[PDB]
Design an enzyme around this catalytic site. Sequence first.
Site, short mmCIF file in Angstrom:
data_model
loop_
_atom_site.label_atom_id
_atom_site.label_comp_id
_atom_site.label_asym_id
_atom_site.label_seq_id
_atom_site.Cartn_x
_atom_site.Cartn_y
_atom_site.Cartn_z
N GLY A 203 -11.29 -41.85 -49.62
CA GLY A 203 -12.08 -42.15 -48.44
C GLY A 203 -12.15 -40.89 -47.61
O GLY A 203 -11.80 -39.82 -48.10
N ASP B 104 -5.98 -53.97 -42.45
CA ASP B 104 -6.99 -53.50 -43.42
C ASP B 104 -6.97 -54.37 -44.69
O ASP B 104 -7.17 -53.88 -45.81
CB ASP B 104 -6.72 -52.02 -43.78
CG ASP B 104 -7.95 -51.27 -44.34
OD1 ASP B 104 -9.10 -51.78 -44.29
OD2 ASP B 104 -7.73 -50.15 -44.86
C1 LIG Z 1 -8.31 -44.72 -47.99
C2 LIG Z 1 -9.08 -44.47 -49.29
S1 LIG Z 1 -7.78 -44.31 -50.53
O1 LIG Z 1 -8.21 -43.41 -51.59
O2 LIG Z 1 -6.50 -43.75 -50.06
N1 LIG Z 1 -7.50 -45.83 -51.19
C3 LIG Z 1 -6.20 -46.42 -51.56
C4 LIG Z 1 -6.92 -47.15 -52.61
C5 LIG Z 1 -7.12 -48.60 -52.20
C6 LIG Z 1 -5.87 -49.43 -52.39
N2 LIG Z 1 -4.84 -49.88 -52.52
N3 LIG Z 1 -6.45 -47.05 -53.94
C7 LIG Z 1 -5.18 -47.08 -54.32
C8 LIG Z 1 -5.20 -47.02 -55.72
C9 LIG Z 1 -4.07 -47.10 -56.73
N4 LIG Z 1 -4.45 -47.31 -57.98
C10 LIG Z 1 -3.53 -47.45 -58.93
N5 LIG Z 1 -2.24 -47.42 -58.66
C11 LIG Z 1 -1.79 -47.25 -57.37
N6 LIG Z 1 -0.51 -47.18 -56.84
C12 LIG Z 1 -0.59 -46.99 -55.51
C13 LIG Z 1 -1.94 -46.93 -55.17
C14 LIG Z 1 -2.69 -47.09 -56.37
C15 LIG Z 1 -6.56 -47.00 -56.09
N7 LIG Z 1 -7.28 -47.01 -54.99
C16 LIG Z 1 -8.17 -46.41 -52.37
#
Ligand SMILES: CCS(=O)(=O)N1CC(CC#N)(n2cc(-c3ncnc4[nH]ccc34)cn2)C1
EC number: 2.7.10.2
Length: 289
Positions: free
Chosen positions: A16, A134
């Site tokens: 983001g 959120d």
């Molecule tokens: C504020 C925009 S962001 O990029 O920081 N945001 C966090 C987000 C949404 C949620 N939760 N994200 C986390 C992951 C994710 N996938 C796979 N394993 C995981 N472990 C910890 C996080 C995680 C994929 N997308 C997208």
Amino acid sequence: QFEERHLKFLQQLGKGNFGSVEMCRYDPLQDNTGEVVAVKKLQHSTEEHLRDFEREIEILKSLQHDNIVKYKGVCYSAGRRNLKLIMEYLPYGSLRDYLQKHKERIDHIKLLQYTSQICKGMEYLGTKRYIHRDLATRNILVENENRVKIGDFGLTKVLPQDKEYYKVKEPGESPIFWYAPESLTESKFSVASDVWSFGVVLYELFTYIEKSKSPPAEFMRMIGNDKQGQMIVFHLIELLKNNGRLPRPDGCPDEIYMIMTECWNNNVNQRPSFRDLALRVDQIRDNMA
Ligand SMILES: CCS(=O)(=O)N1CC(CC#N)(n2cc(-c3ncnc4[nH]ccc34)cn2)C1
């Protein structure tokens, strides 16, 4: 505890403004045996965003629950610049993307299993006096087909010890179509506003993330797609004040839609608790089985 020289970038998992998450391999022995982890970093690391990030890290480290993503550690270069949060990697990505891509194989009993797990995670948050702020399927992650976890805490706040709400207005875009009316009008966030958002999550789930059925799409149609800029918020407020609401999703039973509409009470104090939500969902699950 993690050295940046041993983090190998594999791909971006999310981005983001202000933050992003990467899939990396942590391979201190350099022999391709290390584990794959998720790495969160800031995108435009002002000092304010850095203090917020350190608080976010402390919040996640304090949480230990089956339905909350696991903290693993931190990583920083040059003194303590470019702070990174290390978390367990969950292989099925966000529930939003997972549900969209597997809708034909995910039935209502499974949706209610996810709903129950999200409620239990949120109740745990509430016992720590944490307000998530959120809650949305884009911030829920899928560990396997039977288990989801709340996956991001970038906006989460601790209540003052003497108040049941926290007042905050962040500059920039806010996920206003998930916000309780008092969050839109007064910037007031509480366990009850998390309950309002939880209703929107439940709506999302039963739409299966169909394109034109998203909360932003439905609300913009209800107020008129011509509305621009600041008027959007004003019109949303008026719509919610007159008891305009998201519709029942296609195929959603009336009792599930009723849970949604009770979460969407303009009266903050009459919204159900997360424990009551879990109770009602689990009873419906048992009836279906
Ligand atoms: C504020 C925009 S962001 O990029 O920081 N945001 C966090 C987000 C949404 C949620 N939760 N994200 C986390 C992951 C994710 N996938 C796979 N394993 C995981 N472990 C910890 C996080 C995680 C994929 N997308 C997208």
